[PDB]
Design a protein around this nucleic acid. Structure first.
Ligand SMILES: [Zn+2]
Lengths: 49, 107, 52, 62, 84, 50, 154
RNA sequence: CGUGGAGGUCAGUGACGAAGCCUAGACCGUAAGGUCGGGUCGAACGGCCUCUAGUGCAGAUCUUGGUGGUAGUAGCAAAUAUUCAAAUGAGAACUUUGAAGACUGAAGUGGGGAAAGGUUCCACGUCAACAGCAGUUGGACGUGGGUUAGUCGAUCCUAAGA
RNA sequence: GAAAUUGUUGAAAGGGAAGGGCAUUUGAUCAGACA
């Protein structure tokens, strides 16, 4: 008996794009929220005479 | 082409001024560059019984002279670059200072 | 809508910073927090003279 | 292979710590099927897994 | 420090889950939910919190009984067996 | 904690069973515009404040 | 796929392409420009020499504050480097284009790399964390590469 | 002069290509602008007489989004330290095993717990993203398994209190 | 499937900026033919 190759040819082609869709929504959530990430009210500066 | 011979490497003039955390890790690379020009091929493998003889007294505290026997063996695999390789193993002698380089007879 | 544009709870940050003095959506943790609100030049604000 | 679980199971089986467990380097292909603790005990009795000796701390100078 | 060293001691809760609204608003020392006083018979709702009444008004949930009253009114609260 | 209550364990069970990817046959339906589980959550990124 | 401005004929050419590759665009542009116009075998020996750390890649546009070297003297420039990731990603496409040319039936003795360009790809955001509690960006610049090898005519 | 809609009219234009967009191609107007040719494109849109307005932007430390130079630059320098061989793999400074060298040195870099976390525990498969180098590894990714009480706690009692 | 911004190809210019106004040479391109 012999049949060597066995792996999925559609379940990886449907994961290689749902992964990049998840990554794209993550990136467009990062860059549409990364304007006022550094807004710190009541930030006092440790600089004086 | 398959030759094998013994050398004395003066590691004192190679590990001069080197930091104390790098004396024995430099000594490994100096033995590799020694065997890269004596029987001058790349792919030089050391022995583990050579590594633990370099490293016998810590990082700092490599001995002043080592007595090696470098064997240019022929590569048993396909090896489609430099089909020869050196193999460096120590010679257990007491007081390894005072010996010339000699060619050991193949057997 | 008479409540369009004004369903925000925003107030300006004032001077002492380096941003314009438009009312800004307070809070955190979302993309809306910090954005300029309540204006007519803003995005999400009421129009100039909302039609009655 | 990956014998990081076999060394842990051998430490728990022999009862000595993980720094005293010796797995045979020429028999990793046999050690890799030892997923049970029963197979670890079989390898211990077979001599593939050996407990290493305690490092000596002498009290002679004391 | 009153910023990063004093955020390390934040490890015991002052609000837990309420039973009437399920959100983490039930104060534990004073025993009153701050989003809809749980002990009180009436749910908290203020006319200045007109956005916060939208999140808790009628229609935000299942409306298990109330979604059928218009269908029953349209037929006139009829009872009995339907037809042949 | 290790000594939790049943009200907390009953919510941790739901948060465990809600933490899975989207089923693969959902994407084969006709007017299906649900591409990935957009309410996914793990313990590294966001805490569930219960 | 649609390629760049290629003034060749399709009967004698063979192309290769890679998109969204995570090599840096600034290094991969100099790697792709160093072999522009060369013979295929000469470029494939040259990039192997770069990886063996002889015969550096001349950096010409994106080269501010990089170090000077003695291996730029064959190109006239004084600033040059040996980008290993960029050389490996270009070498994979050179091998793929040589394979496509051999499948089309062009003779590999007169293949020269005519058109070769890189473009930027979408960036890939990731955070770095700075002093006084403020996030910045720390992102990669991926690159599309495309390549055409054609056989030399009269 | 130009824009979004409305009432008339051209029995107006259009899948034999409407609108849009590009065009150191052409024409008209002092100008606002208008017209034509070419490429792209794919479903609707104009001329004139009037009506109506959420009707013309270079600025407001303007709002939102997107992108640059700086710039392959600053840097990735605390916690003494790594080295050899083999295995696996397409690929090993970083995984695994063996050999060395060292470190925490019993107020530990050890063995448990309380808060807090919530499945991170454990196995198999995997490496697109994450692990500010890498990765064959992982507290990641995918699939599953796992927590057993008459005696341990809660439950019971009361404290300051509510 | 616009712009900022970028790659390749082609043309041109370039002694401590670049851009613009008037005029003409030179290169490209267009014009009508008075048919
Ligand atoms: Zn409540």
């Amino acid at each position: 008996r012999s049949f060597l190759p066995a792996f999925d040819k559609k379940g990886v082609q449907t994961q290689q794009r749902v992964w990049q869709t998840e990554r794209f929504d993550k990136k467009r959530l990062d860059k549409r929220s990364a304007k006022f990430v550094n807004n710190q009210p009541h930030y006092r500066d440790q600089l004086l005479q | 082409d398959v030759v094998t011979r013994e050398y004395t490497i003066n590691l004192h003039k190679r590990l001069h001024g080197v930091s104390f955390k790098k004396r024995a890790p430099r000594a490994v690379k100096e033995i590799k560059k020694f065997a890269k020009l004596h029987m001058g091929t790349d792919d030089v493998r050391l022995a583990p019984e050579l590594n633990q003889a370099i490293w016998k007294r810590g990082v700092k505290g490599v001995e002043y002279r080592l007595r090696l026997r470098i064997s240019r063996k022929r590569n048993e695999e396909e090896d489609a670059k430099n089909p020869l390789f050196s193999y460096v193993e120590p010679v257990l002698v007491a007081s390894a200072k005072g010996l010339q380089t000699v060619v050991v007879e193949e057997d | 809508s008479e409540k369009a544009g004004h369903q925000t709870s925003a107030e300006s940050w004032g001077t002492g910073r380096a941003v314009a003095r438009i009312p800004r959506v307070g809070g955190g943790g979302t993309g809306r927090s910090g954005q300029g609100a309540f204006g007519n030049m803003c995005r999400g604000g009421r129009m100039f003279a909302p039609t009655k | 292979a990956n014998l990081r679980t076999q060394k842990r199971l051998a430490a728990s089986v022999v009862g000595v710590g993980k720094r005293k467990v010796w797995l045979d380097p020429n028999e990793t292909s046999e050690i890799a099927q030892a997923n049970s603790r029963n197979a670890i005990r079989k390898l211990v009795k077979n001599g593939t897994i050996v407990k290493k000796a305690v490092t000596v701390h002498s009290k002679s100078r004391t | 420090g009153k910023g990063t060293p004093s955020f390390g001691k934040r490890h015991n809760k002052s609000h837990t889950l309420c039973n009437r609204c399920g959100r983490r608003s039930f104060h534990v020392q004073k025993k009153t939910c701050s989003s809809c006083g749980y002990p009180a018979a009436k749910t908290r709702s203020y006319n200045w919190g007109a956005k916060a009444k939208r999140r808790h008004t009628t229609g935000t949930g299942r409306m298990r009984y109330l979604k059928h009253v218009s269908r029953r009114f349209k037929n006139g609260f009829q009872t009995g067996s339907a037809s042949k | 904690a290790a000594q939790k209550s049943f009200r907390i364990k009953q919510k941790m069970a739901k948060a465990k069973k809600q933490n899975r990817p989207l089923p693969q046959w959902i994407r084969l339906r006709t007017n299906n515009t649900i591409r990935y589980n957009a309410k996914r959550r793990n313990w590294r990124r966001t805490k569930m404040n219960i | 796929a649609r390629y760049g401005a290629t003034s060749t004929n399709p009967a004698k050419s063979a192309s290769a392409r890679g998109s969204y590759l995570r090599v840096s665009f600034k290094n991969t542009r100099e790697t792709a420009q160093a072999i522009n116009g060369w013979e295929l075998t000469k470029a494939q020996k040259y990039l192997e020499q770069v990886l063996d750390h002889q015969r550096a890649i001349p950096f010409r546009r994106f080269n501010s504050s990089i170090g000077r070297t003695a291996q730029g003297k064959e190109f006239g420039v004084t600033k040059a480097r040996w980008p290993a990731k960029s050389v490996k990603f270009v070498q994979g496409l050179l091998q793929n284009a040589a394979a496509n040319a051999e499948a089309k039936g062009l003779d590999a003795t007169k293949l020269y790399v005519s058109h070769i360009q890189v473009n930027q790809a979408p960036k890939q955001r990731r955070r770095t964390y700075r002093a006084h509690g403020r996030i910045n960006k720390y992102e990669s610049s991926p690159s599309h590469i495309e390549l055409v090898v054609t056989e030399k005519e009269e």
